[PDB]
Amino acid sequence: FKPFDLVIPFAVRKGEITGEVHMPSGKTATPEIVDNKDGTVTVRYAPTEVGLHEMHIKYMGSHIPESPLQFYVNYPNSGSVSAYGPGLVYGVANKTATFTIVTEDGLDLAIEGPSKAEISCIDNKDGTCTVTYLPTLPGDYSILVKYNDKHIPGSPFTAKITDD
């Protein structure tokens, strides 16, 4: 299972940053959270279930603005199409947001939220391509990925764009 790894720009001070991942079964687990003493923290988690997970991050008991987040965990042994990367989950407004589509196996992409974002992918020639978008305004962005008039697993995705 591809690990969840994310840098969030939240500056931890006197309070404790905590987290909770909710799995599709109903099980909860605690992600690993590391304060990079510096304006940020890093959240990591190793999935054991397939599909849509919720990540909650809190500071002093209360959700950060960047929280809750959604992420979709692909089945590894699965051939056929997939997407993954931080731009499906979270980004900062006016910084670049990126994810990967795997196509080692007709691709339709749209990104729609607060501001007009016009995706195009760039083929890595390694059976994957890389989408990068510029969400200029903060909000919730829906990212639609289809392979044959059909949503791939996780599509449409929702990525949360903040600025702090």
Residue numbers in the entry: 1744 to 1848, 1853 to 1911
Q: Can you list sentences taken from the study reporting this PDB entry?
A:
Linking actin to extracellular matrix, Filamins (FLN) can simultaneously bind actin and the cytoplasmic domains of transmembrane receptor integrins. FLNs form a homodimeric structure (dimerization occurs at domain 24), presenting an amino terminal actin-binding domain (ABD), followed by a chain of 24 immunoglobulin (Ig)-like domains. In the 16–21 segment, domains 16–1722 form an interacting globular domain pair, while domains 18–1922 and 20–2123 form intertwined pairs. As an important mechano-regulated protein complex, the actin crosslinking protein FLN has a crucial role in the conversion of mechanical cues into biochemical signals.
Here, we present the crystallographically-resolved atomic structure of domains 16 and 17 of the human FLNb, and also how skeletal dysplasia associated mutations interfere in the structure and function of both FLNa and FLNb. The structure of corresponding domains in FLNb were not known, however based on 69% sequence identity, the structure was believed to be very similar to the one of FLNa. Another difference is at edge of domain-domain interface, R1789 in FLNa16 is substituted by K1745 in FLNb16.
